[PDB]
Amino acid sequence: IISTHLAKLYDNLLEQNLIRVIEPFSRVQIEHISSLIKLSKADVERKLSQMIL
Amino acid sequence: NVEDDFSNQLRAELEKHGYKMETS
Amino acid sequence: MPLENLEEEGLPKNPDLRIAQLRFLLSLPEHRGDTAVREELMAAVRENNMAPYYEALCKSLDWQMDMDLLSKMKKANEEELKRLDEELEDAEKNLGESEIRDAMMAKAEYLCQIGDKEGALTAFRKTYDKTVALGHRLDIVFYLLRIGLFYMDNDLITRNTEKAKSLIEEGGDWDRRNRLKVYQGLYCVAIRDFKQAAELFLDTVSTFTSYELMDYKTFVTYTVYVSMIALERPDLREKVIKGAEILEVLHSLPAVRQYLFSLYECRYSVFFQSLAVVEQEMKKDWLFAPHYRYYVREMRIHAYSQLLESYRSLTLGYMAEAFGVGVEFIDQELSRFIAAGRLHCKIDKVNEIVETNRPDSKNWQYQETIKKGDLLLNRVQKLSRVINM
Amino acid sequence: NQVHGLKGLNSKLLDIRTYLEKVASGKLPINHHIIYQLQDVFNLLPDASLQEFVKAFYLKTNDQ
Amino acid sequence: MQSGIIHAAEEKDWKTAYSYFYEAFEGYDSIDSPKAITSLKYMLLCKIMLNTP
């Protein structure tokens, strides 16, 4: 039950963490965002795009 | 307006294949 | 089963291919016994553009009907009437209310299958007056609507729908409420706006148990196709992709499945590839568009918009390749896309960066109030000048 | 009410105005209240701005 | 308690699964079964999936 549930919960964690970084900022480097989330740059670019949509 | 549909289907498939070779 | 008749009338109309479609059109009406009416129906088929009927003076008599079919149906319809009159004589001997109604209502549906509208109305009329099962009541009124959808007279569709619409909600039958959605769903593709149609189909697959409908599998294939046209990536993703139901069922879809998937991947190379082929493939076989311009115009706005919204800048090469068509064609298309105000991007070809400003803002919503108001506004002045004299 | 408001506003401003002439010359007292009120007008600098219109009225009479 | 395992995991109706585990949990305490311990653990698994931490 948890095993399957963890994958989505992981993704959710990225999305909530992302909006927090994005809230005061404007014209912020992606690299700065990647550091705050502490997760890989590519994964971030992808997630970022979904959120815009 | 103008009839975009007749022209787009033929153009999209064909042009795209040449574009693959030409550019990324 | 009868829903294919309605789709088939629609195919000669497609401006993308007139001729092939005629052969699709013939097949199902020959089996059912539309032959008798078809002489009168043939004039409607000319507007739709060409017919291959035995009395047709249209171009394609390459799949022309044989003379014997017209005559066979006609004898059959008279024979059916001869049995009916006699049933009617018997009816007084038993109960007046039961026997005359069952026969009158059966006769109407038969008349409806042929596509004789006049004979249908009269035959039905008595049955409505008398006591008959609520579920049966909703199926018979849908048959009057079904004759009009075949006939493709637009004014005719309206009358039936409004009446049926009151009786369905009054009734207890949920399953029957769904049936009306499909018939109305054919109506929605029939007019220019395709967007309206998708929603009816999403509901009907769940509930509309087989009787007056094709197999579950042929209905699911229609379902996904139409969902893609209206719905963008968030809407499509939640609705279709999230579900338990598709995994449990197992796919038989892959061609249409790629068209749904490409949007999500947000690679327009895959999208456009699937689009030139799919348009031709699906649309020709079964009607979801008698006006080919509407379908591509709406898809292309979404494919460009969605790429642009997410990514500010792209190179011309990527832009040309992903979209498909020529740079020249692309540059003309954009100008029309810009006018709407939802796209608002600039293209530098002299510096080879295509920039997208992308304002999500109040201006987008504002734009909408102003734009929509125009059609109505023009239309009252015209109504008022008529009413006054 | 709007026209009633303008003739009314105008009366209030005369009271202040006639008083200042009298304070400057004729030596009526200088109170912090009078001076506070006058200064604010210049400071606030109101800027004309958009909005508040509707077009609905015609449809309703047509229907009727 | 057995119904939740199936419901949550495959179908992703975490609400329905949760309601089932809560029915077991209530029943179990009255005798004070060890099964009670297990049931409580599952309820927590389902809400974290919804991401209401």
Side-chain angles (χ1 to χ4, degrees), chain C residues 28-265:
Chain C
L28 196 51
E30 199 182 48
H31 169 65
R32 195 167 64 156
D34 295 78
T35 346
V37 88
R38 250 186 295 197
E39 322 307 298
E40 302 185 67
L41 195 277
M42 183 176 102
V45 201
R46 290 182 183 258
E47 308 182 326
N48 290 10
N49 197 274
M50 303 184 281
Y53 297 155
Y54 179 65
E55 293 292 337
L57 317 171
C58 302
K59 196 173 78 184
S60 296
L61 296 173
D62 309 292
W63 313 301
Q64 200 194 12
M65 287 203 283
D66 281 298
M67 192 275 196
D68 324 297
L69 302 184
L70 276 73
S71 298
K72 171 185 77 60
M73 220 300 100
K74 286 160 178 177
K75 247 42 65 189
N77 180 35
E78 182 56 50
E79 283 187 72
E80 191 73 79
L81 300 180
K82 196 195 44 59
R83 280 183 295 271
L84 284 156
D85 293 291
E86 291 183 71
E87 178 155 49
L88 218 316
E89 174 67 67
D90 296 303
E92 46 156 273
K93 313 282 175 60
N94 289 350
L95 194 65
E97 191 279 313
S98 202
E99 276 55 57
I100 302 175
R101 176 201 62 211
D102 299 317
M104 272 290 162
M105 177 177 93
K107 166 184 191 286
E109 285 189 301
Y110 179 96
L111 288 168
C112 293
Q113 298 189 80
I114 303 163
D116 311 306
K117 291 160 298 169
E118 189 45 69
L121 278 160
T122 191
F124 279 136
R125 199 179 64 220
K126 334 213 176 66
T127 304
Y128 297 137
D129 207 284
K130 295 182 189 291
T131 58
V132 60
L134 211 297
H136 288 140
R137 186 168 180 128
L138 300 166
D139 286 328
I140 60 183
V141 185
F142 304 148
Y143 250 116
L144 275 172
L145 182 60
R146 233 165 301 175
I147 309 158
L149 276 180
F150 187 51
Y151 226 105
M152 306 285 171
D153 182 57
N154 296 328
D155 185 47
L156 180 55
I157 299 312
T158 306
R159 301 196 299 273
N160 298 312
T161 293
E162 75 173 316
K163 180 185 173 296
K165 189 174 182 161
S166 58
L167 294 167
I168 62 154
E169 308 292 290
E170 185 186 317
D173 297 307
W174 282 69
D175 190 59
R176 273 51 175 173
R177 289 177 189 197
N178 288 89
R179 323 184 157 189
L180 184 52
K181 303 177 173 199
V182 190
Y183 302 127
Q184 195 188 323
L186 196 301
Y187 159 58
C188 306
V189 294
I191 68 166
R192 278 182 186 197
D193 186 6
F194 303 148
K195 303 179 154 297
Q196 188 173 229
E199 60 96 346
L200 291 321
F201 294 119
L202 296 164
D203 300 300
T204 57
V205 57
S206 285
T207 292
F208 175 1
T209 38
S210 53
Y211 185 62
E212 300 158 36
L213 174 65
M214 54 201 84
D215 189 62
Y216 173 69
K217 206 55 264 178
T218 295
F219 213 52
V220 162
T221 301
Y222 293 1
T223 309
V224 288
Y225 176 61
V226 287
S227 58
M228 183 67 184
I229 310 180
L231 298 175
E232 294 301 286
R233 191 186 180 205
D235 302 296
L236 195 85
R237 185 197 326 148
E238 175 275 296
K239 181 80 192 180
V240 182
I241 300 173
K242 180 163 153 63
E245 32 286 302
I246 325 188
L247 288 288
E248 284 290 279
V249 166
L250 188 63
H251 301 289
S252 288
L253 300 303
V256 71
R257 192 291 319 171
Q258 187 41 259
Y259 171 50
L260 279 64
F261 184 54
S262 57
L263 173 64
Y264 171 81
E265 203 59 36

Side-chain angles (χ1 to χ4, degrees), chain B residues 16 18-24, chain C residues 269 314-322:
Chain B
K16 184 178 306 78
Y19 274 137
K20 299 187 186 307
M21 304 320 303
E22 284 177 56
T23 51
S24 291
Chain C
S269 56
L314 312 159
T315 196
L316 303 174
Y318 178 87
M319 180 174 90
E321 193 278 293

Side-chain angles (χ1 to χ4, degrees), chain B residues 1-9 11-13 15-17 19-20 23-24, chain C residues 269 272-273 276 279-280 292-293 296-297 300 317-318 321 324-325 327 329 333:
Chain B
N1 296 303
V2 287
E3 305 83 66
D4 62 346
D5 188 281
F6 209 50
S7 192
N8 281 135
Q9 47 191 358
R11 291 277 64 46
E13 191 63 47
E15 300 281 292
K16 184 178 306 78
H17 296 301
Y19 274 137
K20 299 187 186 307
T23 51
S24 291
Chain C
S269 56
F272 282 101
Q273 273 293 290
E279 182 220 300
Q280 292 170 16
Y292 68 178
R293 207 263 294 142
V296 134
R297 183 170 289 284
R300 297 203 72 114
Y318 178 87
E321 193 278 293
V325 306
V327 289
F329 206 13
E333 277 202 310

Side-chain angles (χ1 to χ4, degrees), chain E residues 4-34:
Chain E
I5 304 177
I6 305 297
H7 275 240
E10 298 165 60
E11 304 170 352
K12 305 199 170 285
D13 292 300
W14 317 296
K15 307 66 48 178
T16 306
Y18 174 80
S19 284
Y20 295 148
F21 290 127
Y22 211 72
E23 291 173 48
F25 165 64
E26 178 47 60
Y28 293 144
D29 297 335
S30 186
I31 182 245
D32 219 82
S33 282

Side-chain angles (χ1 to χ4, degrees), chain C residues 373 376-377 380 384, chain D residues 51 55 58-59 62:
Chain C
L376 167 55
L377 175 67
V380 278
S384 184
Chain D
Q51 292 292 295
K55 66 173 290 193
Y58 67 141
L59 193 91
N62 207 274

